[model samples]
Target: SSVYITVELAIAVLAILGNVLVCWAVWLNSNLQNVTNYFVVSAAAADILVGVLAIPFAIAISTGFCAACHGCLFIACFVLVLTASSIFSLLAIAIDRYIAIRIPLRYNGLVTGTRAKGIIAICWVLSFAIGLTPMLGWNNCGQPKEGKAHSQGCGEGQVACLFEDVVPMNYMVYFNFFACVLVPLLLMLGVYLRIFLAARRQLARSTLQKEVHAAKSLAIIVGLFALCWLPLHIINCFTFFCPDCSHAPLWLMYLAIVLSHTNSVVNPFIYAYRIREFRQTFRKIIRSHVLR
Candidate 1:
């Protein structure tokens, strides 16, 4: 228990710091200022918030104690909210890249800076809807208005503050996991596949080979997301469908959750290491600060 809590805190700090560094790097670089980076920065913002909030949200469930009728649901559902924003940010990145590839010359006009901001602005609104549905009514919080049994949540105070009781599993597995997560991952995958195929045929292996490299970096970013998120959702699926069967241990869920949070942790490293604009800025940041 001590070990895992320490790990989570460490992840919290690393995610907070690493992503802040990326944001700083992006801000310092004029070249990094563009629509593509807007998407990246939006993601960093979401990851930063996740680091700040989601860790406590995940950790508190172990201890328990949230007030208000649907406060726990509000808290729990927000994890979905921020996480969905991050996912949508990634989706926007893939779609934006696909557009750039298909029409390099017209890509700027096709997706103006204002257009990019608008796209992500819409994503923020959409993410709120997807994540906060539970807060509205589709949650485990029994009806207080209609005079049902005392609501299942911590209306008064105290109960386990996790997906098990407050948030419905059917919602988690089918709507959250299947509809939102799986479909989007698949779409991102196919978009990247098209990118790689285009690269395979011919472009500029002769030139900088940037398309290939960019595609590679984005693939890795998307890949880490699938790698981290898939396992936790799988656990959700298993638990929801087969409650009587041997399910994952509590710590295993903890471990899967650790992976989920740390996905945000690794992304800044990807930015600093793989993507050239960020990589160059990171190099500059290090040289300016560390050496001087």
Candidate 2:
């Protein structure tokens, strides 16, 4: 139990610090304020919220402070919003790269900083609406019984709040999975594929390495996204479709959570390692902090 708690806390700290470094690096460098970096910052901010909110809630649940189903529902909602924001932010970054590489001249006019900000705002709004659906009584668990509020606490076997299982299978399996996981993933894959092909085609036409650089950067991002999220989505699909199946092992579910949380921790490093400006800024920040 102590080991589990320590691991969770460590992850929370790493996620918070890493994402903060990303935001700070972007803010400290004026050159990084482009349309692409805007989405990166938004993603980092969302991960920061995961560190600030989701992990702590998880810790509480693990430690038995949040025993009620309401706490579980809260965690579910937070994860939905955070997951959507992160996914959509990555989608934005991929689209920005596609535009820049595929149509270099029009990219500047198409994805200005203001437009990027608007897009980020819309992503958050949509995520919030989706996450709030369960809380709005769409989860099929129905409302809390009159005179037995969550604050009063329901006993074991009492329905004080809705659990994920009580959510309608149609929404969880078809709507949420398709909208949150499948669509964005497919779009990102298509964009990255276009970027790769476009860059390869341009090798014959021009000597500049702009397209090549874009392709490489986006490839790393897309690959990392798929690697980190694929397991969690697979597990979720299995659990939703075959709720009674013994194929869903307990340890496998835990592994899925760890993998999903690691996504937030790993994203900032991807930017630092893959993006020149971020790499340079990251080194400067580390050097200054180390020297100080």
Highest lDDT among the candidates is held by which one?
1
**What TM-score fits each model?**
0.89, 0.84
RMSD of each: 3.7, 3.9
**Residues 167-280, model 2: lDDT tens digits:** 555566676778877787788888878877866765634534766776677677667777777786776678777878875665665566666677788874575557777888
Which portions of model 2 miss their true places by more than 4 Å? 1-4, 59-72, 143-163, 166-169, 204-208
How accurate locally is residue 132 in candidate 2, as Cα lDDT from 0 to 100? 66
Model 2's alpha-carbon lDDT is 0.71
User: How does residue 176 of candidate 1 score in lDDT?
Assistant: 89
- Enumerate residue pairs that collide in model 2: none
Of candidate 2, the 10-residue stretch with the lowest lDDT total is 60-69
Identify the leading candidate in terms of TM-score: 1
Instruction: Give the alpha carbon lDDT tens digit for every residue of 1-292 in model 1.
Output: 7767888889989988888888888788888888877887887887898889877776765445544447767888888888788778767877888887877899988899888989999888988988999887888767332222134344444444555667888899979897567987898888878878878778445433877876787688778878888999999999998989997997898888888888888763584467766777787888986679
- CA lDDT of 144 in candidate 1? 32
What TM-score quantifies how close candidate 2 is to the native fold? Answer: 0.84
